[PDB]
Design a protein around this ligand. Sequence first.
Ligand code: SF4
Ligand code: SF4
Ligand code: SF4
Ligand code: SF4
Ligand code: FES
Ligand SMILES: [K+]
Ligand SMILES: [Zn+2]
Lengths: 48, 96, 106, 695, 87, 209, 129, 115
Amino acid sequence: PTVKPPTARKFIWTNHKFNLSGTPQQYVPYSTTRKKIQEWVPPSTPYK
Amino acid sequence: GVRTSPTGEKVTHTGQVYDDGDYRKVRFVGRQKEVNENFAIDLIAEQPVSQVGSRVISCDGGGGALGHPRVYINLDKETKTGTCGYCGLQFRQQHH
Amino acid sequence: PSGEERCIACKLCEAVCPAQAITIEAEPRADGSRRTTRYDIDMTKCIYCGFCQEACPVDAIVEGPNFEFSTETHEELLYNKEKLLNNGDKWEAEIAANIQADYLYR
Amino acid sequence: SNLIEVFVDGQSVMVEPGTTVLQACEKVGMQIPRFCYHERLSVAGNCRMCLVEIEKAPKVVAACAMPVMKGWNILTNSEKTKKAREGVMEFLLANHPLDCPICDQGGECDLQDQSMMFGSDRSRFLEGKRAVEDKNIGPLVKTIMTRCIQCTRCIRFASEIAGVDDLGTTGRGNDMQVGTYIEKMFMSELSGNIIDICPVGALTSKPYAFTARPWETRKTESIDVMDAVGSNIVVSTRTGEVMRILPRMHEDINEEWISDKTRFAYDGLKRQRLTEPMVRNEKGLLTHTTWEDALSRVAGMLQSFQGNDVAAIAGGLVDAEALIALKDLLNRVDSDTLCTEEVFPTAGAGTDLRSNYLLNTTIAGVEEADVVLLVGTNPRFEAPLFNARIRKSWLHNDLKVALIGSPVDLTYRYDHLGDSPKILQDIASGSHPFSQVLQEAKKPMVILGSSALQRNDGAAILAAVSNIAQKIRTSSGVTGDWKVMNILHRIASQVAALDLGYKPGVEAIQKNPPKMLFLLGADGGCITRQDLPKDCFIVYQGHHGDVGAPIADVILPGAAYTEKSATYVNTEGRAQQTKVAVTPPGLAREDWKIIRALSEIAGMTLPYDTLDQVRNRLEEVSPNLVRYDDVEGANYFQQASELSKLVNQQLLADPLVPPQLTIKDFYMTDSISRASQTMAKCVKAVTEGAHPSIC
Amino acid sequence: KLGLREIRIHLCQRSPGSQGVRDFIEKRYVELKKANPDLPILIRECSDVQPKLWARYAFGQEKNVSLNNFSADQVTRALENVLSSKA
Amino acid sequence: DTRPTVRPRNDVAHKQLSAFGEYVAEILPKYVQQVQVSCFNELEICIHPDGVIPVLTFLRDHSNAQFKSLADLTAVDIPTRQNRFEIVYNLLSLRFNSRIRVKTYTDELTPIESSVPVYKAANWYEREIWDMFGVFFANHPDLRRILTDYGFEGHPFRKDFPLSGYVELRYDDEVKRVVAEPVELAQEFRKFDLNSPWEAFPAYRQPPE
Amino acid sequence: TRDTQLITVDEKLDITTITGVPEEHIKTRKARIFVPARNNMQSGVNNTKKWKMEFDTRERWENPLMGWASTADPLSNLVLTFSTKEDAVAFAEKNGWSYDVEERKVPKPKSKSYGANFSWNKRTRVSTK
Amino acid sequence: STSVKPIFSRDMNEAKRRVRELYRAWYREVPNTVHLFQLDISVKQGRDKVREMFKKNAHITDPRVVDLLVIKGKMELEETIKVWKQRTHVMRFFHETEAPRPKDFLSKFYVGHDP
Ligand code: SF4
Ligand code: SF4
Ligand code: SF4
Ligand code: SF4
Ligand code: FES
Ligand SMILES: [K+]
Ligand SMILES: [Zn+2]
């Protein structure tokens, strides 16, 4: 890289991070989607 | 950009965030929730609209074979910009 | 280069994956673009065969040069779209150079 | 016979004169390539993709428009035929855009498949392509006209099937563009079908945009319940989620079309859903509970009441399995007050004879009729796929159609006799000149919509219209085996309920106010707490909380038509069963099992434990309910006419006015459609107008 | 109450074994409906079904009487055994 | 034959194998039901299952056949047929440098005669067929499961057998043992419908209906 | 004739006890025998030429970890292809499954004339081409 | 139509001779299986499991189907005698780690959608 530097882009990490497994900064998977079925909320007014 | 729901959990670029009563938040206790902070929708909006002096312009995404399939964009409509369906770049016709 | 995602949720990688390691869901984005709301690769189903990057029409999904990412739990290898984008933002300086040196053989 | 002999690659085949070269190849299992030809539209012959060599002829012929001459040897696989398909496919793809990854038609595209089956494998096109500007034609159909191949299937369909001359070709040459020219919305009850008949991704579904790909979907063959036509559909699902609804070909019901509500109202299945049982807490509010707790409360009340104190109202989407189970449960407490929201006259034979409330001519029988009379109905919106059948006969058979009611645009020109029901009396006597048209008619057809029977004079109107059908079927001039009288229903669960013995309408409940009411999917507002004893016990079983849930004391979640194997009888007496596409959302359960569970807790266990056993019960009550896809003829019209004349009701002076005058009244008629965000956009689009699509 | 609540008649439109019930309906049903205005008399016709006469009494009790090959007069007598006994 | 992308056609071999196909049929009319040669010059002899030993013995021992090597023995499950299974023998002739295919059939309940007396190689191949298809071979030295687990129920390679089976294994700590329980999948296998609705090969079209 | 010394067995073929399938998946199931309907998005008819046997759809839920679609139904992806309806019915009864048969739906022949597009006195005249 | 090659038996009388013979072989082998494998069950439990497995297939009337059941059952006995099976395989007949599924309609109704 001292002779042929990499192309610079503004989204590329400026700080490299090593393997973070087993530490508080580890990767925890989860679903990136939103809830598909919306439930019905009963009215607050007591009726009657 | 990255928002935060009232509980303090960062909202991803897909709009995902666990509700207050969701037990699945427990998976982040003692760990972190991995959220990418470079929202594509925000970055693509920062790009300027290019002015082109023709009815039809073509975009391959930049780089030739390193881009995306070459599509052609119509600029006749004067009330909006023409948008590439692959990369999101916008084009306009010079003074129509 | 603009920072926009290359993936347009075509699902060709999902269809060609020999191990069915890829899961994709998509919808119209707030600006109308065709983008995925889910991109999961089960790195324990994947056979690291390269078909997904051969099938991608826009070079969105690639197999990088990193081979040191051992984990202490089975859950850390179930990548979602957030993990995969961070890998791209992490190894882009190297991935873009490797593609440059090989795209004329593909 | 008159059959002529032609050869398809040397194989003899006998075809009727007028048959086309394309149709002759179907007789031997060969399918000619096509983009413009559709078997249900006019022959265009402008894509030139069906060119086929004829032996001893130097010129290729358009197989879709060329009648077969005697002794022709059609060569479907010669070098000339294959070189004609490569050239045409090469010209189609010259200006086509490289949009396959971002195009919703990818994977189920005729241009892709016929390019890989009949075209070349590369391009010699070294120019710039054409780019066309997109057009807005409503909130349902997304247009990307750079992908259009100028096949004109949408133009022919809109003009012929839908009777709307809004689409056309502007300009000429390579710059020929399909559209409305002006900013206009192609909002029609059959507008969604232009998505299917478009071979390319130029026309696509907007709600379905980008969500799925064809290969990853699972197809469940089911039945549409948004109306009483019983349109056959395919429910596409992926990973336990409903993605889209598609037509399923059925020649005798819906061809290969479906109305917009059927196609786009599915997204209301994902909103305002009842997922957990609820009971009223000590504060008077609905609170989540368990099936054990919820059913114990209902069983406790059911056991303490009997006779004319337990009554039920059946909704518009209930299935036969739930209707029979609820009737059996209530009959075990000596209750016969089983009611439906839809009214139907009970005077005379009432529901004793099926022919008194069926479409006795059958939907497919409209094509052999020569005169059709409509009474107080807007079939365009009540039964959109039964109005399309009328237009097909009006277009191909020169059918004469007359209407007694409000002058609503039916997409075809009819004869307006007026609006007052008193005209029905003139026709039955001879004063009206139209009475002569019915006597001369060889196969007349009289249709009375069930929306006209909602008036207080329904008994008189039914008697008056049935009187006309009696002075035309007995008097010599009509073939013996032709039915004349017809009723056009609009509710999917009506005919099944009347077959089982339910009392039509909520009249029985208003004269014997019960102390325990079952609202089985009843969201029409026919009965409210202002018409019941104070502190009445109301149990609502259903899948949406729209109008009955907020007033109920116990809410028992149920399954929608896409989540159960259930039997529905369409307006012509045809029994059809849905198939499970996805399971109910949360704690929701199959409707007939909730009643079966309730009976066991209350000590009156019903004698069936499985779906096959419940359908055996249906065979006992009405055997036709288990003859799927079969129409059982109903007879004894003479008996109904006699019993109808015993009591002479008078017709109200008020004119007949259908509840749905304009298309803005068509997008919302039930719980599912009123919970849909696409139907809400359609209503906003047809009132406020259209005041960003790229891929 | 032990009274009758419903009568259901099943028959085929063409089978020779259902001719008696059809003869009953063509001539006698109109009279039997006028004498029992408030009694539901369901007449459900299918194809290739053995004729039967169902009678639902109070509290869900149902009894059926086979009408196969019956004449037009036995069918009339069968109903009278149902509308009169009220068991 | 100069076309670079099209496989060259060898018509000399096609002729020789057709002649030997008739030769076999003429000598064994009692069992031979059908003979065919594919466009890639492969010969198939279709026989009645009662002729497994006579037909194989002739091909192994006859001077002009000398098929002394059993390359493979396998079964194919076609549920649409009354005899859903199709036992396939691939034989190799070192003397004449040629290959032949012998095909027969059987259903779930009909035994097939063992080929061990002719080819010792068939000993393990027939265990695999029984193991993975449930076809019983009569007079086998020791017929056992060879590939599945001990006590495995079902024959996996049947078309009606699910891909993921009916049981799965895990270690249970309560009983200090590896236990078997009904199958549950965290992600269900996604079924793709890939067939194009447009005919690909007219040459293989079937008569209508 | 054969010399295998055949025997006479007169009883309906039944292999439920030797297929190894569990009891709960032979008696509670329901196999649908049908000819697949045309995908309305296309015109090809090559997918509507063989009978298929698919079973009833069971519950799919959401994996708590990644949100995937989980199942407990081993026969959720089981599709069999048959040349004829009688072949499909025979296989279903042999394995003890309960089956519902949907009779094939064939498009009816239609009279298509290009000359009717330009008619002197009929409504089939087209206003556009 | 009804002529078919037999496996071992020509009629049910011949097939039931093999079934009883197999039951004797299994009946005498349970005491050794409980011994060699060190199973924590008793001989009575094991011999009642053998009886249960035989009773499941008591409704068969086809001599060819019965022969397969005896052939399959004989293979199971061979593995047990020769200790090709392990303690895990022998104890898989008892389903000790599966919670008892409900049988009545109400219990199945509460917990899910399956019949
Ligand atoms: S490299 Fe992995 S994810 Fe990509 S196609 Fe191959 S198995 Fe699938
Ligand atoms: S990563 Fe590439 S191949 Fe996969 S869905 Fe996105 S664009 Fe298509
Ligand atoms: S219509 Fe869409 S899928 Fe078909 S060829 Fe054009 S871009 Fe590709
Ligand atoms: S929009 Fe579609 S249906 Fe209409 S002409 Fe173009 S390709 Fe044909
Ligand atoms: S299909 Fe004949 S020209 Fe279009
Ligand atoms: K389309
Ligand atoms: Zn671009």
